[PDB]
Amino acid sequence: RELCTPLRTIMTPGPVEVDPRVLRVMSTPVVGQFDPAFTGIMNETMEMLRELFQTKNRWAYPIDGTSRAGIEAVLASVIEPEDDVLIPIYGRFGYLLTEIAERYGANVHMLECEWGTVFDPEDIIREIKKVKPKIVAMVHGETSTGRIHPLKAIGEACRTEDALFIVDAVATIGGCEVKVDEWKIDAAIGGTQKCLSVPSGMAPITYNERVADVIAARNRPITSNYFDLSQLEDYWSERRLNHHTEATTMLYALREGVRLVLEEGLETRFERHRHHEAALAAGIKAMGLRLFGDDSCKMPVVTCVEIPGGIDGESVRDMLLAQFGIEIASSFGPLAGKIWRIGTMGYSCRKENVLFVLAGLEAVLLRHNAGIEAGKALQAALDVYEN
Amino acid sequence: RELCTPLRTIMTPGPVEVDPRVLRVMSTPVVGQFDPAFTGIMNETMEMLRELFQTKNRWAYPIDGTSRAGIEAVLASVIEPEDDVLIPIYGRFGYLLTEIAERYGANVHMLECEWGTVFDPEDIIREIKKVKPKIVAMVHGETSTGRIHPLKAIGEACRTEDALFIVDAVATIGGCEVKVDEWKIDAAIGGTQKCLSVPSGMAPITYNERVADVIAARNRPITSNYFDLSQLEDYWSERRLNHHTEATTMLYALREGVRLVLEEGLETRFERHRHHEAALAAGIKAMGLRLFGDDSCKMPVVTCVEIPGGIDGESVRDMLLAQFGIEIASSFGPLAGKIWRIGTMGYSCRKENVLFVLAGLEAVLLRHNAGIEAGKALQAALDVYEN
Ligand SMILES: *Cc1c(COP(=O)(O)O)cnc(C)c1O
Ligand SMILES: *Cc1c(COP(=O)(O)O)cnc(C)c1O
C-alpha cells in the first residue's frame, strides 16, 4: 500500500514530466522558513527569476498556489472596485482573467477573436487609447487554441497611456521568449509545471516599480490576505514578515528547476523547443494529419492536431494512455472533439518523447482505421533528427 | 551549484521534519490531473482524510495553498458581506481569522482573552445566543500561546443556534484529538507541515452538508476564483471540472503522510505525542526552567519555556541553530522575549530529538551563564523513557 504509479510519457500542455535532477532533490530533508539556509535559497531563487523573466525588477518571487493563484494574487493586488480592466481574449485563459477581474469588482472591457487566431495589436492599442484602462490583462500563450500573441507594441502602448500591462506567461515561460523589460510588461506570472518542468503548485511572478507603487497604496485592503502582495513583498525581503509558511520542498524544486533552465541557456533552450516542434510537425504531416489554426502565430510548445472525420478522439486518447502510457490532451469547450493538443514542454520536449508519441499515435489511429500510410511519420521525424 | 542544505534537528511548532518515507516518495515521476492513476490517488486520499478528521463527511480533500489559503477558501465560500461572524480569539491565529472574515465583508464580533489562557465555553455559548452569528470561527490549538481550546460544548451550541462552526485545526490535526463529527464541527481545516510531517503547501479541509448547501447557494459568487469550494467540489468528484492543475508531487506527499498516520493509529499517535511531551517536560523542569501559561489547557505538541531574566532569548536560539543545527521558535508580538516555543510534532516528536534538544539547550544556556545544573535535564528525560 505504499504509493505505486505507472511511468508515463507525458505529451500534454501540462503538467509535464519533471527532470530527474529536480525529482531527486525533493527527497532532501526540510529546513524552516526562517533558517538562514532557507533565506539563502530564497535570495538565489529571486536572482534566477530575474534572469528567467529577462528583467531587472526588484520583485521576482514565487507564490504558493497554482499558476492561477499567482494570476489572482497580482490582479487582486492592483484591482479596486470599478477600475477599468481591458482584456483581449482569443482563448480559454482570457476568460479566466475576466472571471478574476470581475470577481474583484473591476469594470471589464473585453475584445474577442476567433479561436485559432490572434489580434492585430493595433486593434488592442486603439481600444487602450479609447477606454484608458488602469490595467490591460492578457495571456501571452493560450494553450487552449495553441496560439502565442505578439506583446511588444501592446506593452509600449500601455506604458505611453499609463496602463499596467499584466501578462499570464504560464505556458511560455522557460519555453518561448518572454522579455518583461523589452516588451514593457509591468507584471508577469509564470507557472512551474509547463516549460519549467517543476511540479505543479507554485507560481513565479515579477513586477516593476509601477506595479509596486499601486500595491503600496493598499487605504483599502487587498481582498485576499493570502494573495496580498504588500505582505508577500515583506515575506520576500529583509523584514521576513511571517505571512505564511513558504512551501519548503516546492521552493527546493523551483530553485533546481530554474537553475537547470539557466544552465541550458535561454536562447539555446528556446531553439531546442523549436527543434522538437519541427520534428513533431514533420511526423504529424507525414502521417497525413492536418494542424489546426493560424500557422503564423502557432505557439512553439503546443501542437494542435485535427481529429479526422469519423474517428473518436477520446477513444484515441484513452487507448494511447491505457496501452502506451502516452498522455496527450483533448479539448473541452469550443474545440472539443476537433483537435488533440500535443505539448512539447520542458523535460517532455525531447527526441525520445517526440518519437514515442508519433509511434503511439500512429499505432492507435491505424487501430481506429484512420487513413494513414504506416511508417512514414517516424521516418520524417528521424530525418529532422539526423539532418 | 546543486542544492546543498544542512541536516537540521527541527523542534519548532512548524514546519517540522518530514518522515523519510514521505521524502523518498517525492522523487516519483509525476502523472497528470486527468490520468486514472491520479484520480485513484485523489479518491483514496479523500477516504483517508475522512478518517484523519474522524468524520463521515462526503467533503474531505486538500486545497493547494498553505494552511491559511485553506482557511481563507472555507471562509470566502461561506461569507457574504454583512454576515455576522463570531470569533473568540485567545492567540495570534484568532486575528488571522478576523482579518480574513473582515476582508470578505463580514461584520466581525470578536471576544478576546488573555494570551496563555482560554475561554470558559459558557462565555462563548452566551455570545453565540446573543449575537446569533451565521458563523463561528475558531482556532483549536494556538501555537502562538501554546493553549488548546475545548471545542465540543461550543459546536453543540452552534448546531442548536444554527451557526456554522469553522475550526482552524492546523496545528492539532494528526497530533491531538480532533473529532469533527463528535464535536459538531461544520468545517475543519488542517495543514500539512505540523503534526502530519508533510511538506508545507497544502491544506486538507473537510465540511458537512450544512456547509455544502451554503456553498451551493452561491447568487453572489465567492470572490476568490481559486478558493471557490463550489468549483473545487466539481474538481474533487465524478465530473472532473478543470478548475486548477492539482499539485502532483504535493498530493503524493499528502497521500503518503496520511497513510503513515493511519498505520500508526490515531489514538496510538496521540498517546505517542503525549509520551514525548512528558519526557521534554521533565527535562525542561530538571534543568530549572519554568513553563509559560495555563497548565489546564496546555497544547500537548508545543511547550512554552520561559526565558530567564538577563538571557537574550534570540542569542540562545541563534546559537542552538548555528552550532547544533537545532531549531526552536522565538515569539514575536506580545510574547516576544518572554518564551521559546519547543514543538514536538509528527516525525520531530521522537525520543532522539527530544534528547538532543535538551542537550543542546542545556549547553547553550550554560554558555550564556546559565544558572542551571548539569546532566539533570537528560537523566530526567531518560527516566521517563525508561519507565
Ligand atoms: C502555523 C499555523 C498556521 C499557519 O499556516 P501556514 O501553513 O503558515 O499558512 C495557521 N493556523 C495555525 C493555528 C497555526 O499554528
Ligand atoms: C495552464 C494555464 C494557466 C493556469 O494554470 P494552473 O497551474 O492549472 O492554475 C493559465 N494560463 C495558461 C495559458 C495556461 O496554460
Domain locations along chain B: 8-12+265-387, 19-264
> What are the grid coordinates assigned to B58, written together?
462526503
Provide Rg for chain B, Cα atoms: 21
Q: CA A248 to CA A240: how far, in whole Å?
A: 15
Q: CA B93 to CA B76: how far, in whole Å?
A: 17
Peptide bond preceding A15 in cis form (omega within 30 of 0): yes
Q: CA B228 to CA B99: how far, in whole Å?
A: 18
Q: Is the CB of A94 under 6 A from ligand 2?
A: no
Peptide bond preceding B15 in cis form (omega within 30 of 0): yes
**DSSP code, position A297:** G
How much distance in Å is there from the Cα of A50 to the middle of ligand 2? 21
How much distance in Å is there from the Cα of A67 to the middle of ligand 2? 6
Distance from CA of A122 to the nearest CA of B (A): 31
Q: CA A92 to CA A111: how far, in whole Å?
A: 13
A245, A319, A326, A345, best to mutate vs chain B, most B CBs in 10 Å: A245
* C-alpha separations of B338 from A52, A122, A163, A358, B369 in Å: 44, 63, 49, 66, 17
**Inter-chain residue contact A224 with B103, CB threshold 8 Å:** yes
CB pairs under 8 A between A and B: 225
Structurally, what CATH architecture does the domain formed by A8-12+265-387 represent? Alpha-Beta Complex (3.90)
To one decimal, the resolution in angstroms is: 2.1
Collect all residues with Cβ–Cβ distance below 8 Å to A129 and sequence separation of at least 6: A157, A161
User: Is the backbone of residue A132 left (phi > 0), alpha (psi -120 to 50) or beta?
Assistant: left
| Residue B5 CB-density burial (10 A; 0-12 exposed, 13-18 middle, 19+ buried) | middle
Q: Long-range pairs for B217-220 at CB < 8 Å and ≥24 separation?
A: B218/B77, B218/B80, B220/B80
Give the determination technique: X-ray
Residues of chain A contacting residue B24, judged by C-beta atoms under 8 Å apart: 27
> What are the grid coordinates assigned to B356, written together?
538532543
Give the nearest chain A residue to B249 (CA atoms). A199
Name the one residue in this structure whose C-alpha cell is 454576515.
B83
How much distance in Å is there from the Cα of A200 to the middle of ligand 2? 10
Q: Which of B143, B149, B193 to mutate to test the pocket of ligand 1 (most atoms within 8 A of CB)?
A: B143
Among residues B31, B35, B20, the alpha carbon closest in space to that of B257 is found at B20
Q: Is the CB of A191 under 6 A from ligand 2?
A: yes
Q: Is the CB of A14 under 6 A from ligand 2?
A: yes
**Strand, helix or coil at B303?**
strand
Amino acid at A318: D
Among residues A252, A289, A53, A27, the alpha carbon closest in space to that of B24 is found at A27
Q: Is the CB of A57 under 6 A from ligand 2?
A: no
CATH topology for the B19-264 domain: Aspartate Aminotransferase; domain 2 (3.40.640)
**Inter-chain residue contact A193 with B67, CB threshold 8 Å:** no
> What are the grid coordinates assigned to B159, written together?
448546531
What count of Cα atoms within 13 Å lies in the side-chain half-sphere of residue B219? 13
A42, A99, A225, best to mutate vs chain B, most B CBs in 10 Å: A225
> What are the grid coordinates assigned to A277, written together?
516542434
Collect all residues with Cβ–Cβ distance below 8 Å to A70 and sequence separation of at least 6: A63, A189, A190, A191, A202, A203, A204, A205
Collect all residues with Cβ–Cβ distance below 8 Å to A260 and sequence separation of at least 6: A19, A21, A22, A197
